[PDB]
Design a protein around this ligand. Structure first.
Ligand SMILES: CC(C)(C)C(=O)Nc1nnc(S(N)(=O)=O)s1
Ligand SMILES: [Zn+2]
Length: 257
Protein backbone atom coordinates (compact mmCIF):
# COMPACT_ATOMS: atom_id res chain seq x y z
CA UNK A 1 0.00 0.00 0.00
CA UNK A 2 1.11 3.53 -0.79
CA UNK A 3 2.91 5.75 1.66
CA UNK A 4 5.91 8.04 1.97
CA UNK A 5 8.74 5.54 2.45
CA UNK A 6 11.52 4.45 0.12
CA UNK A 7 9.56 1.53 -1.34
CA UNK A 8 6.04 2.96 -1.36
CA UNK A 9 6.51 6.72 -1.62
CA UNK A 10 5.54 9.30 -4.24
CA UNK A 11 7.94 7.95 -6.84
CA UNK A 12 6.05 4.63 -6.73
CA UNK A 13 2.47 5.93 -6.76
CA UNK A 14 2.14 5.97 -10.56
CA UNK A 15 2.11 2.17 -10.65
CA UNK A 16 -1.22 1.95 -8.82
CA UNK A 17 -2.41 5.43 -9.89
CA UNK A 18 -1.15 6.13 -13.42
CA UNK A 19 -2.67 9.61 -13.32
CA UNK A 20 0.34 10.45 -11.11
CA UNK A 21 2.05 11.36 -14.40
CA UNK A 22 -0.99 13.28 -15.63
CA UNK A 23 -1.42 16.72 -17.12
CA UNK A 24 -2.61 18.55 -13.98
CA UNK A 25 -0.90 16.99 -10.97
CA UNK A 26 -0.31 18.68 -7.63
CA UNK A 27 1.50 20.05 -5.80
CA UNK A 28 3.59 22.43 -7.93
CA UNK A 29 6.27 25.01 -7.39
CA UNK A 30 4.73 28.47 -7.46
CA UNK A 31 7.16 30.66 -9.38
CA UNK A 32 6.04 34.04 -8.05
CA UNK A 33 7.62 35.97 -10.89
CA UNK A 34 5.81 33.87 -13.54
CA UNK A 35 2.40 33.80 -11.86
CA UNK A 36 0.26 36.43 -13.54
CA UNK A 37 -1.95 38.82 -11.64
CA UNK A 38 -5.50 38.23 -12.86
CA UNK A 39 -7.63 41.32 -12.10
CA UNK A 40 -10.76 39.33 -12.97
CA UNK A 41 -10.26 37.06 -9.94
CA UNK A 42 -12.73 37.78 -7.16
CA UNK A 43 -11.86 37.96 -3.49
CA UNK A 44 -12.13 34.61 -1.84
CA UNK A 45 -15.23 34.18 0.31
CA UNK A 46 -14.43 32.00 3.33
CA UNK A 47 -17.68 31.52 5.27
CA UNK A 48 -16.73 29.34 8.24
CA UNK A 49 -18.95 30.89 10.95
CA UNK A 50 -21.33 27.90 11.06
CA UNK A 51 -18.70 25.16 10.78
CA UNK A 52 -19.51 21.93 12.66
CA UNK A 53 -16.41 19.88 13.31
CA UNK A 54 -17.08 16.24 14.08
CA UNK A 55 -14.01 14.05 14.57
CA UNK A 56 -10.23 14.09 14.44
CA UNK A 57 -8.64 11.01 12.91
CA UNK A 58 -5.22 9.49 12.17
CA UNK A 59 -5.65 7.91 8.74
CA UNK A 60 -2.11 6.57 8.39
CA UNK A 61 -1.18 9.40 5.97
CA UNK A 62 -2.02 12.51 7.97
CA UNK A 63 -4.39 13.54 10.68
CA UNK A 64 -7.65 15.11 9.67
CA UNK A 65 -10.48 17.05 11.25
CA UNK A 66 -13.81 16.23 9.64
CA UNK A 67 -16.82 18.50 9.40
CA UNK A 68 -20.53 18.06 8.83
CA UNK A 69 -20.91 18.67 5.09
CA UNK A 70 -24.59 17.63 4.83
CA UNK A 71 -25.63 21.31 4.67
CA UNK A 72 -24.08 24.59 3.53
CA UNK A 73 -22.43 25.40 6.87
CA UNK A 74 -18.76 26.18 6.24
CA UNK A 75 -18.37 27.08 2.58
CA UNK A 76 -15.80 28.48 0.19
CA UNK A 77 -17.03 30.69 -2.65
CA UNK A 78 -15.72 33.35 -4.99
CA UNK A 79 -12.10 33.63 -5.98
CA UNK A 80 -11.71 31.48 -9.09
CA UNK A 81 -14.66 29.27 -8.12
CA UNK A 82 -18.09 28.99 -9.67
CA UNK A 83 -20.65 27.97 -7.12
CA UNK A 84 -20.46 26.83 -3.54
CA UNK A 85 -17.91 24.44 -2.06
CA UNK A 86 -18.60 22.77 1.29
CA UNK A 87 -15.80 22.22 3.79
CA UNK A 88 -15.44 18.50 4.50
CA UNK A 89 -12.09 18.15 6.25
CA UNK A 90 -8.74 19.68 6.89
CA UNK A 91 -5.41 17.96 7.35
CA UNK A 92 -1.72 18.77 7.23
CA UNK A 93 1.50 17.73 5.55
CA UNK A 94 4.73 18.30 7.44
CA UNK A 95 8.40 17.49 7.61
CA UNK A 96 10.95 15.83 9.81
CA UNK A 97 12.69 19.23 10.07
CA UNK A 98 11.46 22.79 9.70
CA UNK A 99 12.96 23.28 6.23
CA UNK A 100 10.65 20.78 4.57
CA UNK A 101 7.08 19.60 4.87
CA UNK A 102 5.03 21.71 2.52
CA UNK A 103 3.74 20.25 -0.72
CA UNK A 104 3.53 23.45 -2.70
CA UNK A 105 6.70 25.48 -2.79
CA UNK A 106 7.16 29.18 -3.45
CA UNK A 107 10.16 29.97 -5.65
CA UNK A 108 11.41 26.52 -4.59
CA UNK A 109 11.10 27.43 -0.89
CA UNK A 110 9.64 24.66 1.26
CA UNK A 111 7.68 25.54 4.36
CA UNK A 112 7.61 23.46 7.53
CA UNK A 113 4.07 22.31 6.86
CA UNK A 114 1.00 22.89 4.76
CA UNK A 115 -2.63 22.94 5.84
CA UNK A 116 -5.24 21.77 3.34
CA UNK A 117 -8.89 22.70 3.84
CA UNK A 118 -10.75 20.39 1.46
CA UNK A 119 -14.07 21.53 0.00
CA UNK A 120 -16.36 19.99 -2.60
CA UNK A 121 -18.67 21.54 -5.17
CA UNK A 122 -22.28 21.18 -4.05
CA UNK A 123 -23.49 20.95 -7.65
CA UNK A 124 -22.18 17.36 -7.58
CA UNK A 125 -24.13 16.37 -4.48
CA UNK A 126 -21.47 14.33 -2.70
CA UNK A 127 -17.70 14.35 -2.48
CA UNK A 128 -17.33 10.99 -4.22
CA UNK A 129 -19.07 12.34 -7.30
CA UNK A 130 -17.13 15.60 -7.04
CA UNK A 131 -13.80 13.75 -7.18
CA UNK A 132 -14.81 12.56 -10.65
CA UNK A 133 -15.14 16.12 -11.97
CA UNK A 134 -12.46 18.58 -13.10
CA UNK A 135 -14.00 21.28 -10.89
CA UNK A 136 -15.23 19.00 -8.13
CA UNK A 137 -13.00 20.09 -5.26
CA UNK A 138 -11.42 23.30 -4.02
CA UNK A 139 -8.52 22.90 -1.62
CA UNK A 140 -7.42 25.95 0.31
CA UNK A 141 -3.70 25.55 1.03
CA UNK A 142 -2.02 27.48 3.82
CA UNK A 143 1.70 27.37 4.53
CA UNK A 144 3.03 26.97 8.05
CA UNK A 145 6.33 28.45 9.13
CA UNK A 146 7.90 27.93 12.53
CA UNK A 147 8.05 30.92 14.84
CA UNK A 148 5.33 32.19 17.15
CA UNK A 149 2.55 29.84 18.19
CA UNK A 150 -0.81 29.83 16.43
CA UNK A 151 -3.30 29.88 19.32
CA UNK A 152 -6.09 28.57 17.07
CA UNK A 153 -4.08 25.40 16.41
CA UNK A 154 -3.47 24.46 20.03
CA UNK A 155 -6.77 22.61 20.47
CA UNK A 156 -5.72 20.38 17.57
CA UNK A 157 -2.19 19.84 18.85
CA UNK A 158 -3.40 18.94 22.34
CA UNK A 159 -5.53 16.01 21.16
CA UNK A 160 -2.92 14.38 18.91
CA UNK A 161 -1.75 12.23 21.85
CA UNK A 162 -5.11 10.45 21.61
CA UNK A 163 -4.78 9.57 17.91
CA UNK A 164 -1.12 8.55 17.76
CA UNK A 165 -1.51 5.58 15.43
CA UNK A 166 -3.34 4.81 12.22
CA UNK A 167 -7.03 4.14 12.73
CA UNK A 168 -7.48 6.11 15.94
CA UNK A 169 -10.10 8.86 16.08
CA UNK A 170 -11.63 11.13 18.68
CA UNK A 171 -14.55 13.46 19.13
CA UNK A 172 -13.48 16.89 17.98
CA UNK A 173 -16.53 19.15 18.13
CA UNK A 174 -16.73 22.94 18.26
CA UNK A 175 -13.40 23.51 16.53
CA UNK A 176 -13.37 26.82 14.67
CA UNK A 177 -11.14 26.62 11.57
CA UNK A 178 -11.18 30.41 11.30
CA UNK A 179 -8.43 30.32 13.92
CA UNK A 180 -6.09 28.75 11.35
CA UNK A 181 -6.33 31.48 8.72
CA UNK A 182 -3.75 34.19 8.11
CA UNK A 183 -4.71 37.85 7.87
CA UNK A 184 -4.56 38.09 4.09
CA UNK A 185 -6.61 36.05 1.66
CA UNK A 186 -4.27 36.92 -1.23
CA UNK A 187 -3.81 33.70 -3.17
CA UNK A 188 -2.44 31.85 -6.15
CA UNK A 189 -4.72 29.51 -8.04
CA UNK A 190 -4.26 26.79 -10.64
CA UNK A 191 -6.04 23.59 -11.74
CA UNK A 192 -4.55 20.51 -10.13
CA UNK A 193 -5.10 17.25 -8.34
CA UNK A 194 -5.34 15.51 -5.03
CA UNK A 195 -1.83 15.15 -3.67
CA UNK A 196 -2.49 11.69 -2.23
CA UNK A 197 -3.89 8.68 -4.06
CA UNK A 198 -6.03 8.46 -6.04
CA UNK A 199 -4.39 11.71 -7.27
CA UNK A 200 -7.63 12.61 -9.05
CA UNK A 201 -7.45 15.70 -11.26
CA UNK A 202 -10.43 17.34 -9.65
CA UNK A 203 -9.00 20.22 -7.61
CA UNK A 204 -9.02 23.97 -8.04
CA UNK A 205 -6.05 24.85 -5.85
CA UNK A 206 -6.19 28.08 -3.90
CA UNK A 207 -2.88 28.64 -2.12
CA UNK A 208 -2.63 31.58 0.25
CA UNK A 209 0.44 33.78 -0.07
CA UNK A 210 0.63 34.57 3.65
CA UNK A 211 1.81 31.71 5.87
CA UNK A 212 0.66 31.20 9.38
CA UNK A 213 3.28 30.87 12.07
CA UNK A 214 3.19 27.91 14.44
CA UNK A 215 5.56 27.22 17.27
CA UNK A 216 8.29 24.61 17.36
CA UNK A 217 6.34 22.87 20.14
CA UNK A 218 3.22 22.73 17.97
CA UNK A 219 4.98 21.20 14.98
CA UNK A 220 6.93 18.82 17.24
CA UNK A 221 3.59 17.36 18.31
CA UNK A 222 2.74 16.68 14.65
CA UNK A 223 5.99 14.73 14.41
CA UNK A 224 5.06 12.43 17.29
CA UNK A 225 2.22 10.85 15.31
CA UNK A 226 2.79 7.44 13.75
CA UNK A 227 2.23 6.17 10.23
CA UNK A 228 1.86 2.67 11.69
CA UNK A 229 -1.04 1.18 13.56
CA UNK A 230 -0.76 0.33 17.23
CA UNK A 231 1.39 -2.72 17.90
CA UNK A 232 3.35 -2.30 14.64
CA UNK A 233 6.95 -1.05 14.40
CA UNK A 234 6.90 2.65 15.19
CA UNK A 235 7.48 4.87 12.16
CA UNK A 236 7.08 8.54 12.90
CA UNK A 237 4.52 10.30 10.71
CA UNK A 238 6.92 12.85 9.22
CA UNK A 239 7.63 13.90 5.65
CA UNK A 240 4.11 13.04 4.51
CA UNK A 241 4.39 15.44 1.58
CA UNK A 242 4.40 14.83 -2.16
CA UNK A 243 7.07 16.89 -3.96
CA UNK A 244 6.30 19.44 -6.63
CA UNK A 245 5.12 17.98 -9.94
CA UNK A 246 5.60 19.28 -13.49
CA UNK A 247 3.52 22.35 -14.23
CA UNK A 248 2.99 21.19 -17.85
CA UNK A 249 0.34 23.22 -19.71
CA UNK A 250 -0.82 25.32 -16.77
CA UNK A 251 -0.68 28.94 -15.68
CA UNK A 252 -0.70 29.92 -12.03
CA UNK A 253 -2.79 33.04 -11.50
CA UNK A 254 -2.34 35.51 -8.64
CA UNK A 255 -5.18 37.41 -6.98
CA UNK A 256 -2.80 40.23 -6.02
CA UNK A 257 -0.20 42.46 -7.62
C1 LIG B 1 -12.59 13.54 0.91
C2 LIG B 1 -11.48 12.86 0.11
C3 LIG B 1 -11.90 12.70 -1.35
C4 LIG B 1 -11.15 11.47 0.67
C5 LIG B 1 -10.27 13.75 0.11
O1 LIG B 1 -10.25 14.82 0.60
N1 LIG B 1 -9.10 13.22 -0.47
C6 LIG B 1 -7.97 14.05 -0.56
N2 LIG B 1 -6.92 13.42 -1.19
N3 LIG B 1 -5.76 14.42 -1.31
C7 LIG B 1 -6.25 15.59 -0.73
S1 LIG B 1 -5.11 16.94 -0.73
N4 LIG B 1 -3.74 16.46 0.07
O2 LIG B 1 -4.82 17.28 -2.12
O3 LIG B 1 -5.85 17.98 -0.01
S2 LIG B 1 -7.72 15.56 -0.15
ZN1 LIG C 1 -3.28 17.51 1.61
Amino acid sequence: HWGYGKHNGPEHWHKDFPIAKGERQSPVDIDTHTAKYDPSLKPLSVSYDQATSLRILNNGHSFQVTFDDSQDKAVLKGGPLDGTYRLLQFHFHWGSLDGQGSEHTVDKKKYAAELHLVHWNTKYGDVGKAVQQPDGLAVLGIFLKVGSAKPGLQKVVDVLDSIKTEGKSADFTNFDPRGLLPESLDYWTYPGSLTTPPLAECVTWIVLKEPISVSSEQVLKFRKLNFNGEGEPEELMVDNWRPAQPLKNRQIKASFK
